[PDB]
Amino acid sequence: GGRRFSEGTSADREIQRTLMELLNQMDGFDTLHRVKMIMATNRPDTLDPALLRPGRLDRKIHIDLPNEQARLDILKIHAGPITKHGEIDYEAIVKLSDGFN
Amino acid sequence: DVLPPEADSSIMMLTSDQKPDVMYADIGGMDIQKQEVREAVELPLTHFELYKQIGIDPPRGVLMYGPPG
Amino acid sequence: KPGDLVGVNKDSYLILETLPTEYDSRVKAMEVDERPTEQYSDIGGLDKQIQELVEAIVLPMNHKEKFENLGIQ
Amino acid sequence: MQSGIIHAAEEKDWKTAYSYFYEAFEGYDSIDSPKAITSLKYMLLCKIMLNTP
Amino acid sequence: KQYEKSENDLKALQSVGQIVGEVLKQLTEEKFIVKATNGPRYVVGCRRQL
Amino acid sequence: CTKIINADSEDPKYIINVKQFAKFVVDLSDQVAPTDIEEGMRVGVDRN
């Protein structure tokens, strides 16, 4: 849990405590970055105001949906272990896969 | 026998397996704001007597609202 | 070893003895509902869904050797 | 300039005093003459007490 | 060999078995308030053999 | 008895659970057999 909205469930808060304690321990009661945590989010719906506010943070880095060129290159490395004779198809697959992560 | 009131605290709770290490010198700005908070929180704890001599009720809590970060 | 039941002394707490591992009879009973077989002869509907499912589970279990050789998941 | 004098000698935080002084000089220089003179010496003063050349 | 292995039970019972905790708060080095894994909290000592 | 599996070097023990939420082992003061202690079977056992 994290985002308690105007009102959330009782349940969100009960679990929310486990995150709060870890976050704190690592940063802003200290100046160190030797012990660090990187947080990944995948659901926008529940995201803590506590984290947002710095000193449990300083940067927000968007990890984008793969690019126009980026999908082409993933396809080439993934194809390589599998037996093939060489395909030219990797360009066709990128179009169809427009917006696939 | 008796124990201190300190004993048998939760470790579930924050700030009894952490402590802050910061001070006023360590940050720069909001010097004006720092003096107000300090006046309200720090002085009555350290000194109960100063507030009594003057005759006012020791300082009440401070509500902190503002920009993120 | 883990999952092994043990005896602990009642009077002073030390691990005195060992006891058989616990299993569950209820799980064994639940198993193998493959008979009678269902096939695709009294179960069906939604022609496309059934085809994809045969591709995802059924064929890789028989055709297992090939996947290892090709190197592909 | 005032925020700076109180912070430099009295409260004794040199980083805090100096920073205000830098602004004070730049502001002072335009309209004023005697005031600006003072503020520049004061800039040097914080750092002399800190004892960095 | 046979002797030492059986005898280990004989001594442990005289030592008495152990109720286990994790240390809740360091107030002083003579008494520590300790928290049982089971639950009910206790005051324990520290001996100078460790 | 929640389940029958135990009979570890004595005439069948099983895990019988008293309603103080503690597990105990059984011995004979009548008999003990695969059929006397079963998966569902409740039992009368002594306090000490």
Short mmCIF file of C-alpha atoms in Angstrom, two decimals:
data_model
loop_
_atom_site.label_atom_id
_atom_site.label_comp_id
_atom_site.label_asym_id
_atom_site.label_seq_id
_atom_site.Cartn_x
_atom_site.Cartn_y
_atom_site.Cartn_z
CA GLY A 1 0.00 0.00 0.00
CA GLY A 2 0.94 3.56 -0.21
CA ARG A 3 -1.55 5.88 -1.79
CA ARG A 4 -4.30 6.22 0.71
CA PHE A 5 -6.18 8.58 -1.65
CA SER A 6 -8.79 10.81 0.15
CA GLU A 7 -9.85 7.45 1.54
CA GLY A 8 -8.46 3.95 0.79
CA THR A 9 -8.99 0.62 2.45
CA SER A 10 -7.87 -0.32 5.98
CA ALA A 11 -5.82 -3.07 4.39
CA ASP A 12 -3.61 -0.70 2.41
CA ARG A 13 -2.34 0.86 5.61
CA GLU A 14 -1.66 -2.43 7.30
CA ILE A 15 0.70 -3.59 4.59
CA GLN A 16 2.05 0.03 3.90
CA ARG A 17 4.17 0.02 7.05
CA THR A 18 6.59 -2.59 5.69
CA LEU A 19 7.75 -0.22 2.82
CA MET A 20 7.94 2.89 5.09
CA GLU A 21 10.36 1.31 7.49
CA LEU A 22 12.84 0.11 4.75
CA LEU A 23 12.91 3.41 2.88
CA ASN A 24 13.67 5.43 5.93
CA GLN A 25 16.41 3.24 7.09
CA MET A 26 18.42 3.57 3.94
CA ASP A 27 18.10 7.34 3.24
CA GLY A 28 17.70 10.85 4.73
CA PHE A 29 18.55 9.83 8.31
CA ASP A 30 22.05 9.59 6.80
CA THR A 31 24.08 11.06 3.93
CA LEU A 32 25.27 7.59 2.54
CA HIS A 33 24.43 6.04 -0.81
CA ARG A 34 26.65 2.92 -0.32
CA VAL A 35 23.47 1.09 0.86
CA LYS A 36 20.68 2.17 -1.60
CA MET A 37 17.35 1.02 -2.86
CA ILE A 38 15.92 1.53 -6.46
CA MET A 39 12.19 1.35 -6.63
CA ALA A 40 10.15 0.04 -9.61
CA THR A 41 6.53 0.79 -10.10
CA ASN A 42 4.24 -0.92 -12.69
CA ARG A 43 0.87 0.09 -11.54
CA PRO A 44 0.32 3.89 -11.40
CA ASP A 45 -2.75 3.49 -9.16
CA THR A 46 -1.14 2.97 -5.77
CA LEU A 47 1.98 5.23 -5.40
CA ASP A 48 2.92 6.76 -2.11
CA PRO A 49 3.05 10.57 -1.50
CA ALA A 50 5.84 9.74 0.99
CA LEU A 51 8.28 8.55 -1.65
CA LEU A 52 7.48 11.36 -3.98
CA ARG A 53 8.63 13.91 -1.59
CA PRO A 54 12.45 13.99 -1.79
CA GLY A 55 15.01 12.74 0.74
CA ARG A 56 13.55 9.26 0.08
CA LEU A 57 14.40 10.32 -3.49
CA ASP A 58 16.04 13.00 -5.63
CA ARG A 59 15.44 11.75 -9.24
CA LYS A 60 12.51 10.34 -11.25
CA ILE A 61 13.70 8.40 -14.28
CA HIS A 62 11.11 7.23 -16.85
CA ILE A 63 11.98 3.82 -18.39
CA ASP A 64 10.28 4.13 -21.66
CA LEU A 65 8.40 1.69 -23.87
CA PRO A 66 11.00 0.29 -26.35
CA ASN A 67 11.83 2.65 -29.24
CA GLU A 68 11.45 2.30 -33.04
CA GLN A 69 15.08 1.12 -33.41
CA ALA A 70 15.20 -0.60 -29.94
CA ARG A 71 12.73 -3.40 -30.86
CA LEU A 72 14.74 -4.31 -33.92
CA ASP A 73 17.90 -4.95 -31.85
CA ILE A 74 16.08 -7.13 -29.13
CA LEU A 75 14.76 -9.30 -31.94
CA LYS A 76 18.13 -9.97 -33.41
CA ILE A 77 19.72 -11.11 -29.95
CA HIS A 78 16.60 -13.29 -29.04
CA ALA A 79 16.64 -15.02 -32.58
CA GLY A 80 20.30 -15.86 -32.36
CA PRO A 81 20.14 -19.02 -30.02
CA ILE A 82 17.34 -20.55 -32.11
CA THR A 83 18.15 -22.38 -35.33
CA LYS A 84 17.23 -20.28 -38.33
CA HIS A 85 18.68 -19.60 -41.77
CA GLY A 86 18.54 -15.83 -41.21
CA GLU A 87 15.33 -13.89 -41.44
CA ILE A 88 14.61 -10.44 -42.80
CA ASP A 89 11.31 -10.56 -40.86
CA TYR A 90 12.64 -8.51 -37.80
CA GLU A 91 11.44 -5.26 -39.60
CA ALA A 92 7.88 -6.71 -40.11
CA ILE A 93 7.61 -7.82 -36.49
CA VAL A 94 8.47 -4.16 -35.16
CA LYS A 95 5.46 -2.69 -36.99
CA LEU A 96 2.94 -5.13 -35.75
CA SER A 97 4.52 -4.91 -32.29
CA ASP A 98 4.11 -1.23 -32.10
CA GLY A 99 3.63 -0.50 -28.35
CA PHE A 100 4.45 -4.04 -27.12
CA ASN A 101 6.89 -3.82 -24.17
CA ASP B 1 11.71 -3.60 41.08
CA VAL B 2 10.90 -1.02 38.48
CA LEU B 3 12.15 -0.40 34.90
CA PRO B 4 12.44 3.07 33.17
CA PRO B 5 9.59 4.14 31.06
CA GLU B 6 12.13 3.92 28.15
CA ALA B 7 12.18 0.09 28.33
CA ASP B 8 9.79 -2.07 26.21
CA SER B 9 9.45 0.14 23.30
CA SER B 10 8.36 -1.16 19.96
CA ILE B 11 10.83 -1.75 17.16
CA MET B 12 7.77 -1.80 14.81
CA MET B 13 7.91 2.02 15.39
CA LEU B 14 10.19 4.52 13.65
CA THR B 15 13.00 6.37 15.35
CA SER B 16 14.01 3.67 17.85
CA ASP B 17 16.33 1.81 15.44
CA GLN B 18 17.02 5.08 13.58
CA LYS B 19 17.89 8.58 14.82
CA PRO B 20 18.52 11.72 12.72
CA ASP B 21 22.13 12.89 12.29
CA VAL B 22 21.22 16.31 10.68
CA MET B 23 21.57 19.68 12.06
CA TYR B 24 20.98 23.31 11.03
CA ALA B 25 24.60 23.76 9.68
CA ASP B 26 24.26 20.71 7.40
CA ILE B 27 21.45 22.31 5.30
CA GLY B 28 21.56 25.82 3.73
CA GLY B 29 18.40 27.71 3.26
CA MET B 30 15.06 28.47 4.99
CA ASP B 31 16.93 30.08 7.85
CA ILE B 32 13.85 32.13 8.74
CA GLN B 33 11.71 29.00 8.96
CA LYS B 34 14.42 27.07 10.92
CA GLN B 35 14.37 29.73 13.74
CA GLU B 36 10.57 29.47 14.05
CA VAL B 37 10.49 25.65 14.33
CA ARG B 38 13.47 25.83 16.68
CA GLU B 39 11.83 28.34 18.95
CA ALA B 40 8.62 26.20 19.23
CA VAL B 41 10.02 22.65 19.47
CA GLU B 42 13.60 22.77 20.76
CA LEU B 43 13.50 25.35 23.55
CA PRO B 44 10.62 23.95 25.79
CA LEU B 45 12.08 20.44 25.81
CA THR B 46 15.51 21.58 26.83
CA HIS B 47 14.12 24.28 29.14
CA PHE B 48 10.79 24.18 30.94
CA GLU B 49 11.77 27.19 33.17
CA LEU B 50 12.06 30.13 30.61
CA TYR B 51 8.53 29.67 29.43
CA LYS B 52 7.33 29.63 33.05
CA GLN B 53 9.05 32.92 34.12
CA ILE B 54 7.40 34.90 31.33
CA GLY B 55 4.15 33.13 32.25
CA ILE B 56 2.89 31.73 29.00
CA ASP B 57 1.82 28.13 28.33
CA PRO B 58 4.82 26.30 26.70
CA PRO B 59 4.71 26.13 22.96
CA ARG B 60 2.19 24.12 21.06
CA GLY B 61 3.02 21.81 18.12
CA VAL B 62 3.86 23.13 14.56
CA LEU B 63 1.93 22.18 11.39
CA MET B 64 4.18 21.85 8.42
CA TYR B 65 2.65 22.33 5.00
CA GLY B 66 4.40 23.53 1.83
CA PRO B 67 6.15 22.56 -1.53
CA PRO B 68 7.45 19.03 -1.98
CA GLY B 69 11.17 18.49 -1.22
CA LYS C 1 16.26 -32.29 8.22
CA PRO C 2 13.39 -29.83 7.33
CA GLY C 3 9.73 -31.11 7.02
CA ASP C 4 10.48 -33.84 9.58
CA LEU C 5 8.35 -33.88 12.72
CA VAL C 6 10.26 -34.05 15.99
CA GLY C 7 9.77 -34.83 19.67
CA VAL C 8 10.78 -32.13 22.07
CA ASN C 9 11.10 -33.04 25.81
CA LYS C 10 8.34 -31.74 27.87
CA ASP C 11 10.22 -30.96 31.05
CA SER C 12 13.27 -29.18 29.53
CA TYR C 13 13.13 -27.96 25.95
CA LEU C 14 15.59 -29.83 23.85
CA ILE C 15 14.86 -31.95 20.73
CA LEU C 16 14.84 -35.55 22.16
CA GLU C 17 13.47 -37.69 19.28
CA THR C 18 12.24 -37.82 15.60
CA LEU C 19 8.87 -38.78 14.09
CA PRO C 20 7.75 -39.68 10.51
CA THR C 21 7.33 -37.00 7.88
CA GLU C 22 3.67 -35.88 7.51
CA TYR C 23 2.05 -36.19 4.03
CA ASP C 24 -1.65 -35.69 3.33
CA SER C 25 -3.97 -38.51 2.17
CA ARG C 26 -6.50 -35.79 0.99
CA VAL C 27 -4.13 -34.74 -1.87
CA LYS C 28 -3.68 -38.31 -3.21
CA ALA C 29 -7.52 -38.79 -3.50
CA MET C 30 -7.81 -35.51 -5.41
CA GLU C 31 -5.28 -36.64 -8.02
CA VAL C 32 -5.77 -38.29 -11.32
CA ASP C 33 -9.09 -37.13 -12.76
CA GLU C 34 -7.87 -38.01 -16.23
CA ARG C 35 -10.31 -40.95 -16.24
CA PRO C 36 -12.83 -40.83 -17.74
CA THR C 37 -11.09 -38.87 -20.48
CA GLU C 38 -12.62 -35.73 -21.76
CA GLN C 39 -10.70 -35.45 -25.06
CA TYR C 40 -12.30 -32.91 -27.49
CA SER C 41 -15.52 -34.95 -27.83
CA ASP C 42 -17.58 -33.85 -24.75
CA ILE C 43 -15.64 -30.69 -24.10
CA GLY C 44 -15.40 -27.89 -26.64
CA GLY C 45 -16.79 -24.56 -27.74
CA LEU C 46 -14.65 -21.56 -28.78
CA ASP C 47 -12.53 -23.17 -31.60
CA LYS C 48 -9.73 -20.71 -31.47
CA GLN C 49 -9.25 -20.99 -27.65
CA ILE C 50 -8.90 -24.74 -27.70
CA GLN C 51 -6.21 -24.49 -30.49
CA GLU C 52 -4.00 -22.07 -28.63
CA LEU C 53 -4.26 -24.11 -25.52
CA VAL C 54 -3.13 -27.32 -27.33
CA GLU C 55 -0.11 -25.28 -28.65
CA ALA C 56 0.78 -23.92 -25.14
CA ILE C 57 0.52 -27.04 -22.95
CA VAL C 58 -0.03 -30.32 -24.79
CA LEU C 59 2.49 -30.27 -27.69
CA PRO C 60 5.60 -29.07 -25.67
CA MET C 61 5.18 -31.97 -23.21
CA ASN C 62 5.44 -34.58 -26.00
CA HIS C 63 7.85 -32.57 -28.26
CA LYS C 64 10.15 -31.68 -25.29
CA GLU C 65 13.51 -32.96 -26.77
CA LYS C 66 13.40 -30.45 -29.63
CA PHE C 67 13.17 -27.39 -27.46
CA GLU C 68 16.47 -28.23 -25.71
CA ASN C 69 18.26 -28.78 -29.06
CA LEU C 70 16.98 -25.45 -30.65
CA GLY C 71 17.92 -23.50 -27.44
CA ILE C 72 14.68 -21.66 -27.41
CA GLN C 73 12.28 -21.60 -24.45
CA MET D 1 23.25 42.63 4.14
CA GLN D 2 21.60 42.61 7.71
CA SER D 3 20.76 38.87 7.53
CA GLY D 4 24.46 38.44 6.79
CA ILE D 5 25.89 40.44 9.77
CA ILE D 6 23.80 38.52 12.25
CA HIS D 7 24.69 35.23 10.73
CA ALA D 8 28.48 35.90 10.35
CA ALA D 9 29.88 37.10 13.62
CA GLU D 10 27.18 36.53 16.13
CA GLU D 11 25.45 33.13 15.30
CA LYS D 12 28.74 32.05 13.68
CA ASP D 13 27.77 30.28 10.40
CA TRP D 14 30.02 31.62 7.72
CA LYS D 15 28.42 29.85 4.74
CA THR D 16 25.06 31.45 5.69
CA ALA D 17 26.54 35.00 6.11
CA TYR D 18 28.49 35.10 2.91
CA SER D 19 25.69 33.99 0.67
CA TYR D 20 23.45 36.89 1.56
CA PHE D 21 26.45 39.33 1.15
CA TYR D 22 27.03 38.31 -2.48
CA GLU D 23 23.37 39.39 -3.28
CA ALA D 24 23.66 42.51 -1.21
CA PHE D 25 26.69 43.83 -3.16
CA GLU D 26 25.09 43.32 -6.60
CA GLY D 27 21.91 45.01 -5.40
CA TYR D 28 23.82 47.89 -3.69
CA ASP D 29 26.21 48.74 -6.51
CA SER D 30 23.45 50.14 -8.85
CA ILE D 31 21.68 52.80 -6.75
CA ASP D 32 24.26 53.29 -4.07
CA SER D 33 27.81 54.40 -3.47
CA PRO D 34 28.90 54.15 0.36
CA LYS D 35 26.73 51.11 1.03
CA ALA D 36 28.25 49.04 -1.72
CA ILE D 37 31.80 49.62 -0.24
CA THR D 38 30.78 48.08 3.04
CA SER D 39 29.16 45.01 1.68
CA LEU D 40 32.25 44.02 -0.32
CA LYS D 41 34.54 44.19 2.81
CA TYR D 42 31.98 42.19 4.70
CA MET D 43 32.20 39.45 1.97
CA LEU D 44 35.94 39.11 2.76
CA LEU D 45 35.21 39.18 6.55
CA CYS D 46 33.17 36.02 6.76
CA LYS D 47 35.84 33.98 5.08
CA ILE D 48 38.78 35.55 7.20
CA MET D 49 37.12 34.25 10.36
CA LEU D 50 36.63 30.81 8.67
CA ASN D 51 40.41 31.12 7.99
CA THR D 52 40.54 30.05 4.39
CA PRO D 53 42.72 32.33 2.09
CA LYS E 1 31.66 -42.14 21.08
CA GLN E 2 28.45 -43.74 22.15
CA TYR E 3 28.93 -42.26 25.61
CA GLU E 4 29.45 -38.63 24.63
CA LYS E 5 26.42 -38.64 22.23
CA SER E 6 23.94 -39.97 24.91
CA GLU E 7 25.57 -37.83 27.66
CA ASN E 8 24.83 -34.64 25.71
CA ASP E 9 21.13 -34.99 26.66
CA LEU E 10 22.13 -35.69 30.26
CA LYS E 11 24.04 -32.33 30.54
CA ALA E 12 21.57 -30.19 28.51
CA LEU E 13 18.74 -31.05 30.92
CA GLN E 14 20.83 -29.97 33.89
CA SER E 15 21.82 -26.63 31.89
CA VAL E 16 18.05 -26.46 31.23
CA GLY E 17 16.78 -25.90 27.70
CA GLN E 18 16.59 -22.40 26.20
CA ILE E 19 13.73 -19.94 25.49
CA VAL E 20 15.01 -17.78 22.55
CA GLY E 21 14.47 -13.98 21.85
CA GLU E 22 15.82 -11.12 19.90
CA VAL E 23 17.11 -8.12 21.76
CA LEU E 24 14.38 -5.40 21.95
CA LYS E 25 16.28 -2.53 23.59
CA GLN E 26 19.67 -1.89 24.98
CA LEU E 27 19.01 0.16 28.21
CA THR E 28 22.24 -0.77 30.06
CA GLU E 29 24.81 -3.63 29.69
CA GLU E 30 23.62 -5.56 32.77
CA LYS E 31 19.97 -5.89 31.91
CA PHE E 32 18.64 -5.96 28.44
CA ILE E 33 14.74 -6.09 27.78
CA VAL E 34 14.45 -9.01 25.40
CA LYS E 35 11.51 -10.07 23.37
CA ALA E 36 10.50 -13.71 23.07
CA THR E 37 9.83 -15.23 19.62
CA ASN E 38 6.78 -16.77 21.23
CA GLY E 39 5.71 -13.19 22.44
CA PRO E 40 5.99 -12.31 26.19
CA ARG E 41 8.76 -9.97 26.90
CA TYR E 42 11.38 -10.65 29.59
CA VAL E 43 14.45 -9.02 31.22
CA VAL E 44 17.72 -11.05 30.68
CA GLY E 45 21.27 -10.75 31.85
CA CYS E 46 24.67 -10.49 30.23
CA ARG E 47 27.49 -12.36 31.65
CA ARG E 48 31.07 -11.49 31.07
CA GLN E 49 31.82 -14.91 29.43
CA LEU E 50 30.75 -13.34 26.16
CA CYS F 1 -5.61 -37.06 15.45
CA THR F 2 -5.40 -34.77 12.36
CA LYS F 3 -3.30 -37.50 10.40
CA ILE F 4 -1.89 -40.87 10.86
CA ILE F 5 1.81 -41.33 10.06
CA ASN F 6 3.76 -41.87 13.35
CA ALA F 7 4.74 -45.13 14.95
CA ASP F 8 8.37 -44.36 15.68
CA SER F 9 9.88 -47.22 17.56
CA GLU F 10 6.79 -47.92 19.76
CA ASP F 11 3.38 -49.34 19.26
CA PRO F 12 1.58 -46.77 17.04
CA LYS F 13 2.04 -43.16 18.40
CA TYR F 14 0.32 -40.79 15.85
CA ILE F 15 0.06 -37.01 16.34
CA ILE F 16 -3.04 -36.40 18.45
CA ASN F 17 -3.75 -32.72 19.17
CA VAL F 18 -5.32 -31.60 22.35
CA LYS F 19 -7.58 -28.48 22.43
CA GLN F 20 -4.83 -26.49 24.33
CA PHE F 21 -3.19 -26.33 20.90
CA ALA F 22 -0.24 -28.62 21.60
CA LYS F 23 0.60 -32.05 19.91
CA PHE F 24 1.30 -35.27 21.81
CA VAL F 25 1.99 -38.90 21.24
CA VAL F 26 -0.03 -41.87 22.38
CA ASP F 27 0.75 -45.11 24.08
CA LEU F 28 -1.27 -48.13 25.12
CA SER F 29 -3.39 -48.41 28.15
CA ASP F 30 -5.97 -50.51 26.18
CA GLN F 31 -4.36 -50.87 22.80
CA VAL F 32 -3.19 -48.84 19.81
CA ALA F 33 -3.53 -50.06 16.23
CA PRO F 34 -3.88 -48.55 12.72
CA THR F 35 -7.71 -48.75 13.27
CA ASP F 36 -7.75 -47.43 16.91
CA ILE F 37 -6.25 -44.09 15.85
CA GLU F 38 -7.38 -42.70 12.34
CA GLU F 39 -7.40 -39.53 10.35
CA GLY F 40 -10.60 -38.11 11.91
CA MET F 41 -10.72 -40.19 15.19
CA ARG F 42 -10.83 -38.34 18.43
CA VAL F 43 -9.14 -40.03 21.49
CA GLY F 44 -9.19 -39.98 25.24
CA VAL F 45 -5.67 -39.32 26.60
CA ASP F 46 -4.35 -38.56 30.06
CA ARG F 47 -3.12 -35.12 31.35
CA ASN F 48 0.12 -36.50 32.68
#
